[PDB]
Amino acid sequence: PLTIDGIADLRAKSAPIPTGVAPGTSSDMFKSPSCYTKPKAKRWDHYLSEESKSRQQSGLISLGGGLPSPEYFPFEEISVKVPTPPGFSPHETQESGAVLTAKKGDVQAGRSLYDLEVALNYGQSTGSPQLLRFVTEHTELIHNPPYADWQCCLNAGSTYGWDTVLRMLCTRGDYILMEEYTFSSAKETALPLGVKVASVKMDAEGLLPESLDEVLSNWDEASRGSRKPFVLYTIPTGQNPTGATQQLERRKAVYKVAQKHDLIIVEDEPYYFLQMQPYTGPPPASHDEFIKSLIPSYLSLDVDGRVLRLESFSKVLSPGSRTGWIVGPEQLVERFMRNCETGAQHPSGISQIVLFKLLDEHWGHSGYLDWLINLRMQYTGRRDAIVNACEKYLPKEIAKWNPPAAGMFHWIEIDWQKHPAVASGKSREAIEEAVFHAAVNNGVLVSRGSWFTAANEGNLFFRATFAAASSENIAEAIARFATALRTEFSL
Amino acid sequence: PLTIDGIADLRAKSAPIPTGVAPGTSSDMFKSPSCYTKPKAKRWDHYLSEESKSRQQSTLKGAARYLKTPGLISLGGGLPSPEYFPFEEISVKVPTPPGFSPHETQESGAVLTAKKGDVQAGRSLYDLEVALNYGQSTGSPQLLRFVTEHTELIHNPPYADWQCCLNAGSTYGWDTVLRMLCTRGDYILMEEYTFSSAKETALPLGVKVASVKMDAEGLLPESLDEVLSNWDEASRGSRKPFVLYTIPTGQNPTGATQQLERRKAVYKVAQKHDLIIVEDEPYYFLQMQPYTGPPASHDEFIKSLIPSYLSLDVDGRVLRLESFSKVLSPGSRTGWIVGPEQLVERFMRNCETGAQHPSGISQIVLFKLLDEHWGHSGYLDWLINLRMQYTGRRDAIVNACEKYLPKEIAKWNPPAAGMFHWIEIDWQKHPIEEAVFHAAVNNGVLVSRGSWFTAEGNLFFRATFAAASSENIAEAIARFATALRTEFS
Numbered sequence: 001p002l003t004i005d006g007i008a009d010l011r012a013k014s015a016p017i018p019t020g021v022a023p024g025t026s027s028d029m030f031k032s033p034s035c036y037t038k039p040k041a042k043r044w045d046h047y048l049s050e051e052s053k054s055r056q057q058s059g060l061i062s063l064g065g066g067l068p069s070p071e072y073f074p075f076e077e078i079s080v081k082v083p084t085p086p087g088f089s090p091h092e093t094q095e096s097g098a099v100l101t102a103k104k105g106d107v108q109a110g111r112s113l114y115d116l117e118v119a120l121n122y123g124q125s126t127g128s129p130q131l132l133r134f135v136t137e138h139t140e141l142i143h144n145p146p147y148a149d150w151q152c153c154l155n156a157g158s159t160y161g162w163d164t165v166l167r168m169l170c171t172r173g174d175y176i177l178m179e180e181y182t183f184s185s186a187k188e189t190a191l192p193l194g195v196k197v198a199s200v201k202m203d204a205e206g207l208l209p210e211s212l213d214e215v216l217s218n219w220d221e222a223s224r225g226s227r228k229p230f231v232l233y234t235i236p237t238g239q240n241p242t243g244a245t246q247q248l249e250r251r252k253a254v255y256k257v258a259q260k261h262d263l264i265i266v267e268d269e270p271y272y273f274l275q276m277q278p279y280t281g282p283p284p285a286s287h288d289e290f291i292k293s294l295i296p297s298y299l300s301l302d303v304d305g306r307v308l309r310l311e312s313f314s315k316v317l318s319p320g321s322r323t324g325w326i327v328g329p330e331q332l333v334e335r336f337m338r339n340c341e342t343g344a345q346h347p348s349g350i351s352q353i354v355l356f357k358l359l360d361e362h363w364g365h366s367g368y369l370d371w372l373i374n375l376r377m378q379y380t381g382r383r384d385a386i387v388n389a390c391e392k393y394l395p396k397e398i399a400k401w402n403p404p405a406a407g408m409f410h411w412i413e414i415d416w417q418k419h420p421a422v423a424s425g426k427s428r429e430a431i432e433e434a435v436f437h438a439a440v441n442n443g444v445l446v447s448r449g450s451w452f453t454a455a456n457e458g459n460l461f462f463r464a465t466f467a468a469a470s471s472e473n474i475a476e477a478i479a480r481f482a483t484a485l486r487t488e489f490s491l
Numbered sequence: 492p493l494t495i496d497g498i499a500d501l502r503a504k505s506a507p508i509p510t511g512v513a514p515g516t517s518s519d520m521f522k523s524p525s526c527y528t529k530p531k532a533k534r535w536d537h538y539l540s541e542e543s544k545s546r547q548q549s550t551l552k553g554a555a556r557y558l559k560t561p562g563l564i565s566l567g568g569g570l571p572s573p574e575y576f577p578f579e580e581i582s583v584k585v586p587t588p589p590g591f592s593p594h595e596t597q598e599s600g601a602v603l604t605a606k607k608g609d610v611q612a613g614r615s616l617y618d619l620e621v622a623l624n625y626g627q628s629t630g631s632p633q634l635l636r637f638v639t640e641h642t643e644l645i646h647n648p649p650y651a652d653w654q655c656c657l658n659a660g661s662t663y664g665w666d667t668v669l670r671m672l673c674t675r676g677d678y679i680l681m682e683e684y685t686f687s688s689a690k691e692t693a694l695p696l697g698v699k700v701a702s703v704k705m706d707a708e709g710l711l712p713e714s715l716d717e718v719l720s721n722w723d724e725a726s727r728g729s730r731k732p733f734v735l736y737t738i739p740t741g742q743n744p745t746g747a748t749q750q751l752e753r754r755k756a757v758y759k760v761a762q763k764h765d766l767i768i769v770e771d772e773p774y775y776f777l778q779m780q781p782y783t784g785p786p787a788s789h790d791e792f793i794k795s796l797i798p799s800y801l802s803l804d805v806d807g808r809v810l811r812l813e814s815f816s817k818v819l820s821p822g823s824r825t826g827w828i829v830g831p832e833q834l835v836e837r838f839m840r841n842c843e844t845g846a847q848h849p850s851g852i853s854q855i856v857l858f859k860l861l862d863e864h865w866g867h868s869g870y871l872d873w874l875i876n877l878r879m880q881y882t883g884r885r886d887a888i889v890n891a892c893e894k895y896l897p898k899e900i901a902k903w904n905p906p907a908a909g910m911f912h913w914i915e916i917d918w919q920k921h922p923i924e925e926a927v928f929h930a931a932v933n934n935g936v937l938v939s940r941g942s943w944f945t946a947e948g949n950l951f952f953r954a955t956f957a958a959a960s961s962e963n964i965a966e967a968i969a970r971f972a973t974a975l976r977t978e979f980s
């Protein structure tokens with residue numbers, strides 16, 4: 001297996017990076033030999049949409065292509081001030097931060113492997129080799145996929161990733177499998193395409209393998225109006241919005257069912273590196289130790305090559321950058337890339353060169369992992385504050401909650417039936433709108449559990465992130481919400 | 492009508508720009524009052540696809556609009572605390588108004604700097620804190636105001652409810668209007684010779700393309716009418732096409748630019764057959780001075796620009812695909828669409844469940860250059876410069892052709908706009924096209940084969956004069972002339 005200490009050698013022993021405009025690359029330029037001793041992935045021809053199968057590809061002097069001259073790109077230099085690994089706080093970066101300059105002629109001047117003229121011009125649909133090498137190495141270091149022909153493709157984000165895998169696998173009048181309570185934007189992306197959602201139940205630890213098996217085993221084309229679904233959308237770590245994180249045992253169990261029913265697993269994992277210690281009343285010995293500490297992903301267990309892993313920089317570095325990637329078997333990744341060519345094309349070149357300078361040249365794999373440890377330490381303090389505030393202010397007779405292990409979401413259950421629903425407007429939805437609107441008026445924003453339902457009126461929940469608000473404000477916000485609850489649940 | 496000198500006062504008398512994280516806006520917050528006196532666009536309910544009709548407002552993005560009310564604390568949308576973005580300052584060195592050459596910007600360039608806490612320090616209306624966080628599908632209000640103003644000045648559209656929406660690019664724009672206005676089985680209308688990328692974006696959606704004959708000035712109205720009128724008796728198993736894809740200026744790959752008279756003839760035909768006109772205009776500012784063998788001011792420069800389809804859009808049936816690619820940087824992955832509120836809202840919906848918005852890092856760098864430094868003046872100055880650069884490059888390739896290409900078998904008109912030179916050769920004369928491609932590559936010149944661009948007749952070759960040096964432009968043409976002479980004896 002590839003370790004941080006093996007990367008300098010892998011690069012020495014592998015082909016040079018092409019530093020000209022929009023060069024052909026793949027992950028295969030960057031993968032370690034070990035990868036090719038593993039078996040090949042299963043084929044998925046039968047699962048490709050008619051749209052997706054239809055998609056196709058587009059020393060001498062060239063007057064051939066429509067690439068403009070960098071002369072008429074009016075950016076000579078792009079600089080960013082970034083934290084130097086010791087200190088990662090805004091105060092520390094101001095104090096001791098490093099300035100990274102990307103110049104035109106950087107490649108001629110031997111300064112950089114990513115020229116601003118190249119970053120400012122058109123790119124390929126897989127993204128720059130400069131950034132794809134880091135993403136590929138990162139994928140190998142963290143997940144180490146157990147099949148030979150895995151590949152990364154850079155993205156305009158997981159939102160675009162999900163839209164374009166939905167188009168790749170699904171047709172008008174198909175079902176896909178989601179968790180009881182899922183990401184609203186994921187469902188929001190699926191419906192307009194004619195894709196229906198068959199929900200599968202979950203516990204405090206997330207997706208239940210029994211329910212998944214039960215839905216797929218008990219599937220009748222006639223009643224549902226469509227064929228057995230073969231796509232599973234799931235958030236394994238810090239589930240949106242429950243915050244439930246599957247342990248290794250649940251994931252192995254889920255993978256078995258997917259093997260039996262021949263499912264493609266789409267793991268959307270934005271908070272994968274936000275795994276914290278379990279909450280208590282009130283450190284990683286090495287980078288190998290930190291990586292070992294992370295509960296393994298579906299990609300890690302992906303013996304069959306049936307997994308698409310949606311990764312993003314949004315919850316790790318910046319949602320603004322609109323930069324992510326997909327990890328999957330060559331055949332599906334190749335299909336995704338064609339959709340990018342006639343769509344988003346690639347994430348912004350300025351986004352790519354700023355990320356590459358920080359991740360590749362400055363931080364490296366060490367500095368990046370150092371930053372994710374700090375992000376783990378940060379979100380831990382915030383996780384404690386929201387749970388401490390919840391039980392010190394919230395009415396325990398009306399509100400119930402499990403403290404979360406990973407993510408930035410807190411799931412609060414509300415006994416909606418312990419409020420005067422005997423007379424007048426006895427609609428669970430009515431108490432919901434009331435409880436939400438009563439919260440803004442006492443000055444707190446929360447997410448309505450009903451937005452996250454994949455589709456039944458039982459208990460009601462509220463989603464409360466501990467990422468959005470200043471650490472000091474976390475306590476004040478829950479109190480404000482506690483007050484709202486008491487008022488609304490009163491005379 | 493809105494002019495550059497009208498802008499400072501439109502701003503003074505308008506609402507404050509929202510400097511918060513992921514704020515709600517629309518062009519309707521930056522459009523001058525004159526717009527609202529004009530009539531409204533026609534309704535497009537009957538042209539909206541099942542997919543697009545079916546789309547809905549993002550409940551999270553919609554809930555973010557709550558972040559506006561002050562002293563309100565958020566446990567809602569998962570937009571991270573700025574402390575978890577490791578970019579303190581982002582700086583960019585760009586040219587001053589007098590000199591735009593890379594060498595001139597090296598010597599006299601300005602360094603614009605975007606820092607976290609700039610909006611609290613009163614340095615700019617765009618905080619890096621905001622740029623680096625999630626944004627709404629329309630793009631940042633700071634960048635959207637500039638593009639909306641720019642759209643008013645240049646095109647100043649003749650209907651009330653026109654709107655702009657920021658973009659991942661014109662390629663992403665075309666992807667989303669095709670899904671918004673087309674279903675499996677339908678036809679769309681494209682020029683006989685057209686952008687290969689535009690045709691490839693449509694084929695896998697099950698959309699067929701109805702070709703329409705061109706001349707030296709582009710799309711022919713009598714051919715468009717003929718195709719659509721003939722649809723009544725000769726349907727191709729599908730309903731009459733209502734979408735026209737058109738590149739009016741420096742058309743790819745012909746280089747044919749429709750003049751105002753030609754755009755007026757086409758538009759009248761688009762009224763008769765109630766067509767929606769999608770005008771892909773990436774080379775609109777690559778318009779050059781006429782070929783032989785100085786735009787006094789901004790006010791003169793805008794006079795000399797051929798009016799776009801949007802400028803004649805009285806019905807509101809025009810969707811304009813704009814991009815910064817051929818004027819600032821293709822790498823920026825930042826464009827926009829202009830159209831009636833109805834289709835732009837549907838466009839915006841799909842963006843929310845798609846690309847979402849152009850990179851915030853792309854947006855703050857474009858806004859800082861365009862709004863804070865150059866201004867509309869500086870940008871027009873830069874566009875005039877661009878005009879003059881491409882003029883010189885157009886000259887170079889045409890001069891070469893007139894000096895090397897054999898008139899016996901080679902025919903060519905000079906381009907008025909864009910970066911493409913379109914060469915016509917008579918195949919019958921030589922002792923069939925594959926033999927002309929490879930032969931020329933044998934002399935070490937590469938050109939693009941016309942057959943690659945079909946949506947019979949004479950054979951053509953597209954030669955771009957955008958990138959290569961004045962030296963290599965001649966050389967390359969000379970290498971072609973000799974290869975053609977060898978193939979045709």
Ligand SMILES: *Cc1c(COP(=O)(O)O)cnc(C)c1O
Pocket residue numbers: 156157158159160183235240268270311312313314315319323324569847
């Ligand atoms: C926040 C979030 C996203 C956002 O992805 P981008 O890369 O920012 O487009 C996607 N999926 C889930 C589950 C999220 O929570």
Ligand SMILES: *Cc1c(COP(=O)(O)O)cnc(C)c1O
Pocket residue numbers: 066345659660661662663686738743771773813814815816817821825826
């Ligand atoms: C170059 C070009 C574009 C540019 O598209 P973006 O995705 O905005 O870069 C669009 N249309 C045509 C016809 C082009 O030639």
